[PDB]
Design a binder for this molecule. Structure first.
Ligand SMILES: CC(C)Oc1ccc([C@H](N)O)c2cc(C(=N)N)sc12
Ligand SMILES: CC(C)Oc1ccc([C@H](N)O)c2cc(C(=N)N)sc12
Ligand SMILES: *SCCNC(=O)C(C)(C)Oc1ccc(Cl)cc1
Ligand SMILES: *SCCNC(=O)C(C)(C)Oc1ccc(Cl)cc1
Ligand SMILES: [Mg+2]
Ligand SMILES: [Mg+2]
Ligand SMILES: [Mg+2]
Ligand SMILES: [Mg+2]
Ligand SMILES: [Mg+2]
Ligand SMILES: [Mg+2]
Lengths: 236, 5, 236, 5
């Protein structure tokens, strides 16, 4: 642990500075160091961890997609042989992406999930576990691909079960979990009907609970509900 | 791509 | 040299892929490897080298400015002591930036400049040398600050002398050199009048030579001339 | 910031 000598509070402070400076790799390294102090994370600290790695892996995914598209075009008929370089470089980016996913999953397994007892923390971490297995599934092609997909499904499903029992239907974590699990169904599991059904039921149940909320909570919930609607519009 | 958070 | 085992042509090919994927750190590493093969670079390869490092250092500079602003605000009256963390993290980013600048300057000194005999290559490399000393000057505060500024000035001046003797006034490299040396005068050397005079004379001499150009060359030259005009508008 | 290339 390269951050072993830095105070927990200083790591959190620097993660926030790194975010302001749009230095997301630094932000992720600082948050990994904070997690490795062994204490539970607060709600805000969980957000910092998620933002950092979402931005890092999001950039890797975007690059992987660009390279994969070039590689596919290089393998079509009439294409001129350009050597192993496209595959090699796609593989380089892919291996780095897998390394980041493995790091996040490692933090969740050692030992964030097992210490998370409140729904707001446990659902959030299980959602993250589903997300990072989903990113592994996006690039997977080997003997373990079905097991990777099933690991994502299982994490999302445990999060869903807790969220439905312990959170109101407008809770933003519950909504974001459903948003992402719906995307999992559509893009990973080849289950577009399940994706659409989940997004629609989630949206409708949230709508019916908005009446209970303050103006600020309403803003938070409707923001995520709009993402559900956006995906439904894309898919129907 | 679809929206995720 | 971590890229020592990869073919020169493969490094160039992967630099282009990295650019398409917006992976500028990879792009810079591939181009450093290509330079370290020891052969001269073509016009396009010089562009790849410059684009890669410009993007890397540009991101570092933007982050350094964000952090430096936060640090300045933390040192004002009435500000609450927040510890050494802002300074430490600004210093971290600064040291990384200086490392990149040192790497580029090292490639120019070993041995790109000394083998560059044509104006298009030599002016381009001397401009780069001025640029990377300028980025070092932006963060410099020690005993060597005046020498860093003078190293930038000297490189730009040699490039200017060659460019005026060997290139037409519309040559895009000549124009970009003048653009950047003018910025050096304004921002680094505290010489706004020299900055304005250089930008204006460069613009006017280019205008008078546009009549000699094809449509495509005219587009290239007027693009840079517009940047000169933009800076003049900012400064007057 | 001013333009550079
Ligand atoms: C207040 C705690 C519970 O954490 C957040 C709540 C809401 C937000 C956003 N403003 O809605 C947010 C953004 C964050 C960041 N990007 N560093 S942490 C964070
Ligand atoms: C054709 C050779 C001499 O190199 C260029 C000339 C012009 C341009 C731009 N299109 O004007 C350009 C962009 C490049 C890149 N970003 N990889 S190389 C490059
Ligand atoms: S945790 C980061 C702060 N939150 C956000 O950026 C938005 C997207 C506004 O809210 C959510 C993020 C993650 C979840 Cl699970 C739910 C809402
Ligand atoms: S070398 C990168 C390709 N060129 C460019 O991106 C633009 C900015 C259009 O042209 C110039 C770049 C650098 C110089 Cl010195 C001059 C023009
Ligand atoms: Mg301690
Ligand atoms: Mg692989
Ligand atoms: Mg169900
Ligand atoms: Mg050889
Ligand atoms: Mg320093
Ligand atoms: Mg003069």
């Amino acid at each position: 642990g390269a951050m072993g000598s830095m105070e927990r509070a200083s790591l959190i402070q620097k993660a926030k500075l790194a975010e302001q400076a749009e230095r997301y790799e630094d932000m992720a390294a600082f948050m990994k160091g904070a997690v490795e102090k062994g204490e539970e994370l607060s709600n805000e600290e969980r957000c910092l961890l998620s933002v950092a790695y979402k931005n890092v892996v999001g950039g890797q995914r975007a690059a992987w997609r660009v390279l994969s598209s070039i590689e596919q075009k290089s393998n079509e008929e009439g294409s001129e042989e350009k050597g192993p370089e496209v595959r090699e470089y796609r593989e380089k980016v892919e291996t780095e992406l897998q390394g980041v996913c493995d790091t996040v999953l490692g933090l969740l397994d050692s030992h964030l999930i097992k210490e998370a007892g409140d729904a707001e923390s446990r659902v959030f971490y299980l959602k993250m576990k589903g997300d990072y297995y989903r990113y592994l599934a996006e690039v997977a092609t080997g003997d373990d691909k079905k097991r990777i997909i099933d690991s994502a499904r299982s994490a999302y499903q445990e999060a869903m079960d807790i969220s439905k029992k312990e959170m109101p239907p407008t809770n933003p974590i519950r909504l974001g979990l459903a948003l992402n699990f719906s995307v999992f169904h559509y893009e990973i599991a080849n289950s577009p009907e399940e994706a659409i059904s989940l997004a629609k039921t989630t949206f409708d149940e949230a709508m019916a609970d908005l009446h209970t909320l303050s103006e600020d909570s309403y803003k938070d919930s409707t923001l995520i509900m709009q993402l559900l609607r956006d995906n439904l519009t894309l898919w129907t | 791509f679809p929206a995720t958070v």
